[PDB]
RNA sequence: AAUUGAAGAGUUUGAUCAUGGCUCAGAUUGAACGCUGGCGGCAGGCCUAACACAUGCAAGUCGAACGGUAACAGGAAGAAGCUUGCUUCUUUGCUGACGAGUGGCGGACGGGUGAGUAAUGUCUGGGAAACUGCCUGAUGGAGGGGGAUAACUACUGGAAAC
RNA sequence: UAGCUAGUAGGUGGGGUAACGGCUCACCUAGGCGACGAUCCCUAGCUGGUCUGAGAGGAUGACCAGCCACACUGGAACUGAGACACGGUCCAGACUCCUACGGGAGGCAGCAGUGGGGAAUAUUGCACAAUGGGCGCAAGCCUGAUGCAGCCAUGCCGCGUG
RNA sequence: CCCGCAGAAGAAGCACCGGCUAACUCCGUGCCAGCAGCCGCGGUAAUACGGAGGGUGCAAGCGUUAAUCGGAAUUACUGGGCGUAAAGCGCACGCAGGCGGUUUGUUAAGUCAGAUGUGAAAUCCCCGGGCUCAACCUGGGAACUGCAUCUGAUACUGGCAA
RNA sequence: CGGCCGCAAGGUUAAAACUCAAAUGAAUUGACGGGGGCCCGCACAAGCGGUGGAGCAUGUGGUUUAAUUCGAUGCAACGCGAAGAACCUUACCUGGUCUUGACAUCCACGGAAGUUUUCAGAGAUGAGAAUGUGCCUUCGGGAACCGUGAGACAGGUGCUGC
RNA sequence: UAGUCCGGAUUGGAGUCUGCAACUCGACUCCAUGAAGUCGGAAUCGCUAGUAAUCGUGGAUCAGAAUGCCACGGUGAAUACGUUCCCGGGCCUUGUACACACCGCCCGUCACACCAUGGGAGUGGGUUGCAAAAGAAGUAGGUAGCUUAACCUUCGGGAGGG
RNA sequence: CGCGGGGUGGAGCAGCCUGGUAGCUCGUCGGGCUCAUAACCCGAAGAUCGUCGGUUCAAAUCCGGCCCCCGCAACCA
RNA sequence: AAUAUG
């Protein structure tokens, strides 16, 4: 959840911004006001938002010296809004910032393995041929057989024989190994893929 | 005419006596909170932030110190309107007075506060090298002259204070 | 907290103050204070008293009264009998307000009262009728000193609820 | 402040009840819930919890909490201890400090006696007086255990001499 | 922790927060000691014959089951309560049945009690057909006994031997 | 001298008896079958004289139902040198941190839960010594210039001030 | 196991080329001891010697195949 | 010889 402490000059303003604040609140991030004030912003107002862990916000009215003493000691942000629509916007922006949802992935390259080599003590070592896209060291991979995923991981070695390289491109012979894994045979497929976040704003 | 007074208990151990702590019965406050609350007398009532402050009020007063009319309260003189005996309205510091001002005395008292101060402080007992308007007792002078300046007038810099 | 002191300790001369004085200067001498606790740090307004205690003692300094210190922070002087001045002044600093933004104004640790602090402490009252001050020959004016009321079971004491 | 009118009319709560400590049973809960100042109560017959009845204390207050002293001879001067319970330095020599055999003279510092000045007033205390009495207010006395100076005493201690 | 001292290890000097309601000395009675003395018992020693192996009896635990009734569990339970489970005993189990009742006291009312027999049902049992009319009392009746109905009640080897 | 003319388990067939009843679940007989077992691990029990041991008999219980229990008799022993030792018990004395009594009590690591606190490179504030910079305002000292009513004057200016 | 050391009971070992009997520690399950428990003591369970053949009175450790694990060379980009 | 815990 996110907490706010709001202290306005007038009694109408706490009643007006409380009505909009219960619209913003939702299961994803819950917002609540704690100890709504009327009048000058004090030490005891700032101490409550230090106790509860909360944002210190103000309508027209602004901080006293004894409120500044608490803010300079224990850092709590002070933002006052004399325009109420921008105040209803800025709480929503704080709630939106708390959220960070993921969404999607897409292949960078796809490769088929052919002509296996196989250590007695260090497992199978796969020759590959990239059929589409760019195969690259620095991103997640999906090892699949017959459309089921055998393993997922990050590439350890992109390396035909001794030719260790960060990236290699379609239509070219490659050699391949994945971190903490050595079960890559013949007729397996590697899909290497880049990942996409969404970071959606709150409703 | 007289200065009168001192209580203990519980609790270590199976039980005892010591040593010994902890706790309670007493009286009290510049008190708070809880529950309850009819009236009267007398006394007390921001101990915390010497933290910050709206508005009103908390030191002025003398015309028997002096120019003066800024008043307004009359009189007198005078001019008018006529009602010829009256109101009306200009002059006049003449006057009962009195804003602003000059000058006198008070503003150092009365009141608030406990921040700083462990000794320039305070309290108690002494001292000399001193002053002391206002208040008193004692003895004498209180003669004769001059130049300014605020107020007020004539202007002017200034948003406002000035 | 065991060593601390150069105007430090003493003398002469000059200057200074109402007056004594390293008070302040020039020169000369090398002392001064120190375990009967110097110096340094922390903490604290002090006393007549209050409270407790059989007394000795202990704790404590609200109210009342005496005295000192402080007056937004820091420093200085003037006027005056007396101030290095709570509601006088000048300058700097912090901070609040006003403004034509150039530049100015303000100091409730006076009485009421408000914000804030905090467990918690009051009415933006009435009158100079009385006592006592300030001015004045006096009338008289001024006096949130003081006398009074309002508010709270806060305390003491009296009375009732037959 | 006094008189008159009406009619028991308008006006009693609070804590506590196992021992300490004045004041007892039943019911509900069943080592749960909770009480608790201290030692402790409650795990199916709870005089200790919760409720009810009865009882005890105190009164327009009652109780809890915080704060101070008392009890506490538990910092012990008056008024405690140190063989084994907390407590005699591991032991010795020694400066500063404390204390000192016995005789006479002298001084009068300490000490003891008397007097004067001072020990603010309020307070405290006693005897009185005035508010319906009391609280409260107030007359006078005593008190203010102290200190300084002067005049005396010389046993004891100190100084000084033999 | 700080100062001082020491080459260093360390010594000397020396707290507070916090926690517990006890910590502790001597002494008394008892128990305990792989502490000591003395002393006794099929305790050992000296012997005899057995158990523990085997088969069977009876009992217990465990196991299983619709039920394997309940209690007894170191010596001081385990051929025990049980001096004797084919039904009964018998409590436990599956069915079939009754609810003032199988069994006692009590009230009211009718019918002597009773000896005979049959069908249906596993039996408990219901439903019949038979037969009899007894001691005292004026038979006004009852005392014995059976059936019906009411409610006070009857019942429990259900639980708690802390 | 052997699994036997030793031992009788188990099982088949046919009977008897008590009783409403003999299937799971009786006793007993008759014929037939003839497991294991050839003296039993560590360990452990009883008994000191008509006893141990060994062979029979009777009763209570009871319709039928002992290898149990209770009772009776026949035959009938071994060995006790001794209290070193084990076990159990009594008395005296000693030690004790034990007192629901050694089946008592209780120590620390490590883990755990709870609780408080020290050091701390440093970082950010207040206060403040020392060395430099800074120098408002005010006072004190020195002053060319600018400016100047009182006093002095030869009337040009001086004295003196700002 | 390309070459190394091993394949024994539940685990770890001994039995060795010196071919005539697979036993010993910790465990497993029971019994005893103790007031009880651990400890201790007494017992019982548990094997084609991986798998096969050469072997030979009989392969028992002796041999070689099949096979498995590990040793390292290596089927070790 | 050696003997632990409740």
Short mmCIF file of N, CA, C and O (backbone and C1' of nucleotides) in Angstrom, two decimals, chain B residues 52-106:
data_model
loop_
_atom_site.label_atom_id
_atom_site.label_comp_id
_atom_site.label_asym_id
_atom_site.label_seq_id
_atom_site.Cartn_x
_atom_site.Cartn_y
_atom_site.Cartn_z
P A B 52 10.85 32.62 20.06
"O5'" A B 52 9.58 32.73 19.12
"C5'" A B 52 9.77 32.59 17.69
"C4'" A B 52 8.43 32.52 16.92
"C3'" A B 52 7.62 33.81 17.02
"O3'" A B 52 8.16 34.79 16.11
"C1'" A B 52 6.22 31.96 17.41
P C B 53 7.67 36.30 16.27
"O5'" C B 53 6.15 36.19 15.82
"C5'" C B 53 5.20 37.19 16.21
"C4'" C B 53 3.75 36.75 15.92
"C3'" C B 53 2.73 37.71 16.53
"O3'" C B 53 2.50 38.82 15.63
"C1'" C B 53 2.24 35.56 17.27
P A B 54 1.59 40.02 16.14
"O5'" A B 54 0.18 39.62 15.53
"C5'" A B 54 -0.03 39.58 14.09
"C4'" A B 54 -1.52 39.43 13.73
"C3'" A B 54 -2.48 40.53 14.21
"O3'" A B 54 -2.47 41.69 13.36
"C1'" A B 54 -3.43 38.47 14.71
P U B 55 -2.14 43.12 13.95
"O5'" U B 55 -3.49 43.45 14.73
"C5'" U B 55 -4.74 43.71 14.07
"C4'" U B 55 -5.95 43.54 15.03
"C3'" U B 55 -5.94 44.47 16.25
"O3'" U B 55 -6.38 45.79 15.87
"C1'" U B 55 -6.43 42.28 16.97
P G B 56 -5.62 47.05 16.46
"O5'" G B 56 -6.17 47.11 17.95
"C5'" G B 56 -7.47 47.70 18.21
"C4'" G B 56 -8.01 47.34 19.60
"C3'" G B 56 -7.23 47.96 20.78
"O3'" G B 56 -7.62 49.33 21.00
"C1'" G B 56 -7.61 45.68 21.20
P C B 57 -6.48 50.43 21.15
"O5'" C B 57 -5.95 50.23 22.64
"C5'" C B 57 -6.76 50.62 23.77
"C4'" C B 57 -6.45 49.82 25.06
"C3'" C B 57 -5.05 50.03 25.66
"O3'" C B 57 -4.93 51.31 26.34
"C1'" C B 57 -5.52 47.75 25.66
P A B 58 -3.45 51.88 26.49
"O5'" A B 58 -2.67 50.91 27.49
"C5'" A B 58 -3.08 50.84 28.88
"C4'" A B 58 -2.15 49.94 29.74
"C3'" A B 58 -0.73 50.48 29.88
"O3'" A B 58 -0.68 51.49 30.91
"C1'" A B 58 -0.67 48.15 29.35
P A B 59 0.70 52.21 31.22
"O5'" A B 59 1.11 52.84 29.81
"C5'" A B 59 0.23 53.84 29.22
"C4'" A B 59 0.86 55.25 29.16
"C3'" A B 59 2.06 55.31 28.18
"O3'" A B 59 2.12 56.54 27.41
"C1'" A B 59 2.76 55.94 30.32
P G B 60 1.15 56.74 26.16
"O5'" G B 60 -0.03 57.71 26.63
"C5'" G B 60 0.26 59.04 27.13
"C4'" G B 60 0.31 59.14 28.66
"C3'" G B 60 -0.21 60.48 29.24
"O3'" G B 60 -1.65 60.49 29.42
"C1'" G B 60 1.92 60.00 30.13
P U B 61 -2.44 61.85 29.11
"O5'" U B 61 -1.87 62.89 30.17
"C5'" U B 61 -2.11 62.78 31.59
"C4'" U B 61 -1.26 63.79 32.40
"C3'" U B 61 -1.45 65.26 32.04
"O3'" U B 61 -2.63 65.76 32.72
"C1'" U B 61 0.90 64.76 32.18
P C B 62 -3.19 67.19 32.36
"O5'" C B 62 -2.16 68.13 33.13
"C5'" C B 62 -2.26 69.56 32.95
"C4'" C B 62 -1.05 70.33 33.54
"C3'" C B 62 -0.81 71.68 32.83
"O3'" C B 62 -1.61 72.72 33.45
"C1'" C B 62 1.18 70.42 32.80
P G B 63 -2.86 73.33 32.67
"O5'" G B 63 -2.22 74.40 31.67
"C5'" G B 63 -1.29 75.38 32.20
"C4'" G B 63 -1.38 76.75 31.50
"C3'" G B 63 -2.81 77.34 31.50
"O3'" G B 63 -2.85 78.78 31.71
"C1'" G B 63 -2.06 77.08 29.29
P A B 64 -3.16 79.33 33.17
"O5'" A B 64 -1.90 78.88 34.04
"C5'" A B 64 -0.64 79.60 33.87
"C4'" A B 64 0.35 79.37 35.03
"C3'" A B 64 0.67 77.89 35.30
"O3'" A B 64 2.06 77.68 35.68
"C1'" A B 64 -0.29 78.81 37.22
P A B 65 2.97 76.73 34.76
"O5'" A B 65 3.65 77.71 33.70
"C5'" A B 65 4.49 78.80 34.15
"C4'" A B 65 5.68 79.06 33.19
"C3'" A B 65 5.27 79.55 31.79
"O3'" A B 65 5.02 80.99 31.77
"C1'" A B 65 6.78 77.78 31.54
P C B 66 3.80 81.49 30.86
"O5'" C B 66 4.39 81.32 29.39
"C5'" C B 66 5.61 82.01 29.02
"C4'" C B 66 5.97 81.73 27.56
"C3'" C B 66 4.83 82.06 26.59
"O3'" C B 66 4.75 83.50 26.44
"C1'" C B 66 5.80 79.96 26.04
P G B 67 3.69 84.13 25.45
"O5'" G B 67 4.40 83.87 24.06
"C5'" G B 67 3.70 84.02 22.82
"C4'" G B 67 4.50 83.44 21.65
"C3'" G B 67 3.58 83.32 20.44
"O3'" G B 67 3.57 84.59 19.73
"C1'" G B 67 4.52 81.22 20.88
P G B 68 2.17 85.02 19.11
"O5'" G B 68 1.68 83.67 18.43
"C5'" G B 68 0.28 83.41 18.23
"C4'" G B 68 0.05 81.93 17.88
"C3'" G B 68 -1.45 81.54 17.76
"O3'" G B 68 -1.99 81.75 16.45
"C1'" G B 68 -0.41 80.06 19.24
P U B 69 -2.59 83.15 16.03
"O5'" U B 69 -3.70 82.74 14.96
"C5'" U B 69 -4.88 82.00 15.38
"C4'" U B 69 -4.71 80.47 15.24
"C3'" U B 69 -6.06 79.82 14.98
"O3'" U B 69 -5.93 78.57 14.25
"C1'" U B 69 -5.34 79.32 17.20
P A B 70 -5.96 78.67 12.65
"O5'" A B 70 -5.78 77.16 12.16
"C5'" A B 70 -4.92 76.24 12.87
"C4'" A B 70 -5.49 74.81 12.92
"C3'" A B 70 -6.96 74.77 13.37
"O3'" A B 70 -7.85 74.96 12.24
"C1'" A B 70 -5.67 73.29 14.70
P A B 71 -9.32 75.50 12.50
"O5'" A B 71 -9.99 74.35 13.38
"C5'" A B 71 -10.20 74.71 14.77
"C4'" A B 71 -10.46 73.48 15.63
"C3'" A B 71 -11.90 73.31 16.09
"O3'" A B 71 -12.71 72.73 15.03
"C1'" A B 71 -10.40 72.87 17.87
P C B 72 -14.13 73.39 14.79
"O5'" C B 72 -14.73 73.31 16.26
"C5'" C B 72 -15.22 72.07 16.82
"C4'" C B 72 -15.77 72.28 18.25
"C3'" C B 72 -17.04 73.17 18.32
"O3'" C B 72 -17.94 72.70 19.34
"C1'" C B 72 -15.34 74.12 19.61
P A B 73 -19.43 73.20 19.47
"O5'" A B 73 -19.22 74.19 20.69
"C5'" A B 73 -19.06 73.68 22.03
"C4'" A B 73 -19.12 74.80 23.10
"C3'" A B 73 -19.81 76.13 22.74
"O3'" A B 73 -21.26 75.99 22.83
"C1'" A B 73 -17.74 76.57 23.83
P G B 74 -22.17 77.17 22.27
"O5'" G B 74 -21.94 78.29 23.37
"C5'" G B 74 -22.10 79.70 23.10
"C4'" G B 74 -21.46 80.52 24.23
"C3'" G B 74 -21.48 82.05 24.09
"O3'" G B 74 -22.73 82.59 24.59
"C1'" G B 74 -19.28 81.38 24.57
P G B 75 -23.43 83.78 23.82
"O5'" G B 75 -22.41 84.98 24.11
"C5'" G B 75 -22.44 85.53 25.46
"C4'" G B 75 -21.24 86.44 25.79
"C3'" G B 75 -21.15 87.75 25.00
"O3'" G B 75 -22.03 88.74 25.59
"C1'" G B 75 -19.04 86.71 25.01
P A B 76 -22.79 89.75 24.63
"O5'" A B 76 -21.58 90.60 24.06
"C5'" A B 76 -20.93 91.58 24.90
"C4'" A B 76 -19.65 92.13 24.24
"C3'" A B 76 -19.89 92.84 22.90
"O3'" A B 76 -20.37 94.18 23.11
"C1'" A B 76 -18.11 91.33 22.67
P A B 77 -21.44 94.77 22.09
"O5'" A B 77 -20.53 95.07 20.83
"C5'" A B 77 -19.56 96.14 20.82
"C4'" A B 77 -18.56 95.96 19.66
"C3'" A B 77 -19.21 96.09 18.27
"O3'" A B 77 -19.38 97.48 17.91
"C1'" A B 77 -17.84 94.18 18.32
P G B 78 -20.63 97.87 17.02
"O5'" G B 78 -20.35 97.16 15.63
"C5'" G B 78 -19.38 97.61 14.67
"C4'" G B 78 -19.15 96.56 13.56
"C3'" G B 78 -20.37 96.34 12.64
"O3'" G B 78 -20.44 97.39 11.66
"C1'" G B 78 -19.54 94.25 13.33
P A B 79 -21.82 97.76 10.98
"O5'" A B 79 -22.05 96.55 9.98
"C5'" A B 79 -21.23 96.43 8.79
"C4'" A B 79 -21.41 95.06 8.10
"C3'" A B 79 -22.81 94.87 7.52
"O3'" A B 79 -22.92 95.56 6.25
"C1'" A B 79 -22.20 92.94 8.72
P A B 80 -24.38 95.81 5.67
"O5'" A B 80 -24.86 94.34 5.37
"C5'" A B 80 -26.27 94.04 5.25
"C4'" A B 80 -26.50 92.52 5.27
"C3'" A B 80 -27.99 92.17 5.32
"O3'" A B 80 -28.56 92.13 4.00
"C1'" A B 80 -26.87 90.98 7.00
P G B 81 -30.02 92.66 3.70
"O5'" G B 81 -30.82 91.40 4.19
"C5'" G B 81 -30.99 90.19 3.44
"C4'" G B 81 -31.77 89.14 4.26
"C3'" G B 81 -33.15 89.56 4.76
"O3'" G B 81 -34.08 89.46 3.66
"C1'" G B 81 -31.97 88.66 6.58
P C B 82 -35.61 89.76 3.87
"O5'" C B 82 -35.62 90.90 4.97
"C5'" C B 82 -36.87 91.30 5.57
"C4'" C B 82 -37.02 90.68 6.97
"C3'" C B 82 -38.24 91.25 7.70
"O3'" C B 82 -38.90 90.21 8.47
"C1'" C B 82 -36.21 91.95 8.76
P U B 83 -40.47 90.00 8.42
"O5'" U B 83 -40.92 90.98 9.59
"C5'" U B 83 -41.98 90.60 10.51
"C4'" U B 83 -41.50 90.28 11.94
"C3'" U B 83 -40.54 91.32 12.58
"O3'" U B 83 -40.93 91.65 13.94
"C1'" U B 83 -39.60 89.19 12.76
P U B 84 -41.47 93.11 14.26
"O5'" U B 84 -40.13 93.94 14.56
"C5'" U B 84 -39.31 93.55 15.69
"C4'" U B 84 -38.22 94.60 16.04
"C3'" U B 84 -38.73 95.99 16.51
"O3'" U B 84 -38.21 96.35 17.82
"C1'" U B 84 -36.94 96.21 15.01
P G B 85 -38.95 95.85 19.14
"O5'" G B 85 -38.18 94.50 19.52
"C5'" G B 85 -38.86 93.24 19.68
"C4'" G B 85 -37.98 91.99 19.41
"C3'" G B 85 -36.93 91.65 20.51
"O3'" G B 85 -36.77 90.21 20.66
"C1'" G B 85 -35.81 92.17 18.50
P C B 86 -36.02 89.52 21.87
"O5'" C B 86 -34.51 89.46 21.36
"C5'" C B 86 -33.90 88.29 20.78
"C4'" C B 86 -34.45 87.81 19.40
"C3'" C B 86 -33.47 86.95 18.56
"O3'" C B 86 -33.50 85.56 18.96
"C1'" C B 86 -34.48 88.61 17.17
P U B 87 -32.36 84.98 19.91
"O5'" U B 87 -32.13 83.50 19.34
"C5'" U B 87 -31.12 83.26 18.32
"C4'" U B 87 -31.74 83.01 16.93
"C3'" U B 87 -30.71 82.76 15.80
"O3'" U B 87 -30.26 81.39 15.71
"C1'" U B 87 -32.22 84.41 15.12
P U B 88 -28.71 81.15 15.40
"O5'" U B 88 -28.55 81.80 13.96
"C5'" U B 88 -29.14 81.21 12.78
"C4'" U B 88 -28.91 82.04 11.50
"C3'" U B 88 -27.43 82.21 11.13
"O3'" U B 88 -26.96 81.03 10.44
"C1'" U B 88 -28.47 84.31 10.98
P C B 89 -25.56 80.39 10.85
"O5'" C B 89 -24.56 81.46 10.23
"C5'" C B 89 -24.37 81.52 8.80
"C4'" C B 89 -23.69 82.82 8.34
"C3'" C B 89 -22.26 82.97 8.89
"O3'" C B 89 -21.37 82.16 8.10
"C1'" C B 89 -23.44 85.01 9.18
P U B 90 -19.86 82.02 8.53
"O5'" U B 90 -19.28 83.36 7.94
"C5'" U B 90 -17.92 83.76 8.21
"C4'" U B 90 -17.64 85.20 7.75
"C3'" U B 90 -16.45 85.79 8.51
"O3'" U B 90 -15.24 85.41 7.81
"C1'" U B 90 -18.27 87.24 8.78
P U B 91 -13.89 85.25 8.61
"O5'" U B 91 -13.77 86.70 9.20
"C5'" U B 91 -12.83 87.02 10.24
"C4'" U B 91 -12.88 88.52 10.60
"C3'" U B 91 -12.16 88.71 11.93
"O3'" U B 91 -10.75 88.97 11.68
"C1'" U B 91 -14.33 89.54 12.14
P U B 92 -9.66 88.08 12.40
"O5'" U B 92 -9.86 88.55 13.89
"C5'" U B 92 -9.50 89.90 14.28
"C4'" U B 92 -9.95 90.18 15.73
"C3'" U B 92 -9.55 89.10 16.74
"O3'" U B 92 -8.17 89.25 17.12
"C1'" U B 92 -11.81 89.73 17.09
P G B 93 -7.16 88.02 17.11
"O5'" G B 93 -7.47 87.32 18.50
"C5'" G B 93 -7.59 88.18 19.66
"C4'" G B 93 -7.40 87.47 21.00
"C3'" G B 93 -5.93 87.17 21.38
"O3'" G B 93 -5.70 87.46 22.79
"C1'" G B 93 -7.19 85.20 21.42
P C B 94 -5.66 89.00 23.22
"O5'" C B 94 -7.14 89.19 23.76
"C5'" C B 94 -7.64 90.37 24.39
"C4'" C B 94 -9.01 90.10 25.06
"C3'" C B 94 -9.25 88.72 25.71
"O3'" C B 94 -8.65 88.65 27.02
"C1'" C B 94 -11.13 89.27 24.40
P U B 95 -7.75 87.39 27.39
"O5'" U B 95 -8.87 86.30 27.69
"C5'" U B 95 -9.67 86.45 28.89
"C4'" U B 95 -10.97 85.64 28.83
"C3'" U B 95 -10.80 84.12 28.73
"O3'" U B 95 -10.26 83.52 29.93
"C1'" U B 95 -12.42 84.78 27.18
P G B 96 -10.95 83.25 31.31
"O5'" G B 96 -11.64 81.85 31.04
"C5'" G B 96 -12.45 81.24 32.06
"C4'" G B 96 -13.21 80.00 31.53
"C3'" G B 96 -12.37 78.74 31.23
"O3'" G B 96 -12.02 78.06 32.46
"C1'" G B 96 -13.86 79.11 29.45
P A B 97 -10.72 77.13 32.45
"O5'" A B 97 -11.13 75.99 31.42
"C5'" A B 97 -10.16 75.33 30.58
"C4'" A B 97 -10.68 75.20 29.13
"C3'" A B 97 -9.79 74.37 28.20
"O3'" A B 97 -10.06 72.96 28.40
"C1'" A B 97 -10.45 76.38 27.11
P C B 98 -8.88 71.99 28.84
"O5'" C B 98 -8.10 71.81 27.47
"C5'" C B 98 -8.72 71.06 26.40
"C4'" C B 98 -8.14 71.51 25.05
"C3'" C B 98 -6.65 71.25 24.79
"O3'" C B 98 -6.43 69.88 24.37
"C1'" C B 98 -7.23 73.46 24.16
P G B 99 -4.94 69.34 24.31
"O5'" G B 99 -4.78 69.04 22.75
"C5'" G B 99 -5.50 67.95 22.14
"C4'" G B 99 -5.39 67.93 20.59
"C3'" G B 99 -3.96 67.82 20.02
"O3'" G B 99 -3.52 66.44 19.97
"C1'" G B 99 -5.09 69.58 18.94
P A B 100 -2.03 66.10 20.40
"O5'" A B 100 -1.14 66.87 19.34
"C5'" A B 100 -0.90 66.36 18.00
"C4'" A B 100 -0.29 67.43 17.07
"C3'" A B 100 1.08 67.90 17.57
"O3'" A B 100 2.15 66.98 17.22
"C1'" A B 100 -0.21 69.76 16.96
P G B 101 3.30 66.81 18.32
"O5'" G B 101 3.98 68.22 18.42
"C5'" G B 101 4.62 68.90 17.32
"C4'" G B 101 5.05 70.31 17.74
"C3'" G B 101 5.93 70.36 18.99
"O3'" G B 101 7.22 69.79 18.70
"C1'" G B 101 4.44 72.21 18.91
P U B 102 8.19 69.47 19.91
"O5'" U B 102 8.57 70.88 20.52
"C5'" U B 102 9.55 71.71 19.88
"C4'" U B 102 9.68 73.06 20.59
"C3'" U B 102 10.17 72.88 22.03
"O3'" U B 102 11.59 72.60 22.02
"C1'" U B 102 8.41 74.43 22.00
P G B 103 12.06 71.40 22.93
"O5'" G B 103 11.83 71.98 24.36
"C5'" G B 103 12.64 73.05 24.87
"C4'" G B 103 12.05 73.60 26.17
"C3'" G B 103 11.85 72.60 27.32
"O3'" G B 103 13.11 72.32 27.98
"C1'" G B 103 9.89 73.81 27.06
P G B 104 13.30 70.86 28.60
"O5'" G B 104 12.40 70.87 29.92
"C5'" G B 104 12.69 71.84 30.96
"C4'" G B 104 11.63 71.80 32.08
"C3'" G B 104 11.51 70.47 32.83
"O3'" G B 104 12.58 70.34 33.81
"C1'" G B 104 9.35 71.28 32.30
P C B 105 13.47 69.02 33.77
"O5'" C B 105 12.51 67.95 34.44
"C5'" C B 105 12.20 68.04 35.85
"C4'" C B 105 10.92 67.27 36.20
"C3'" C B 105 10.92 65.75 35.91
"O3'" C B 105 11.66 65.02 36.93
"C1'" C B 105 8.91 66.72 35.13
P G B 106 12.42 63.70 36.47
"O5'" G B 106 11.23 62.70 36.06
"C5'" G B 106 10.42 62.13 37.12
"C4'" G B 106 9.19 61.36 36.61
"C3'" G B 106 9.46 60.15 35.69
"O3'" G B 106 9.95 59.02 36.44
"C1'" G B 106 7.72 61.42 34.77
#
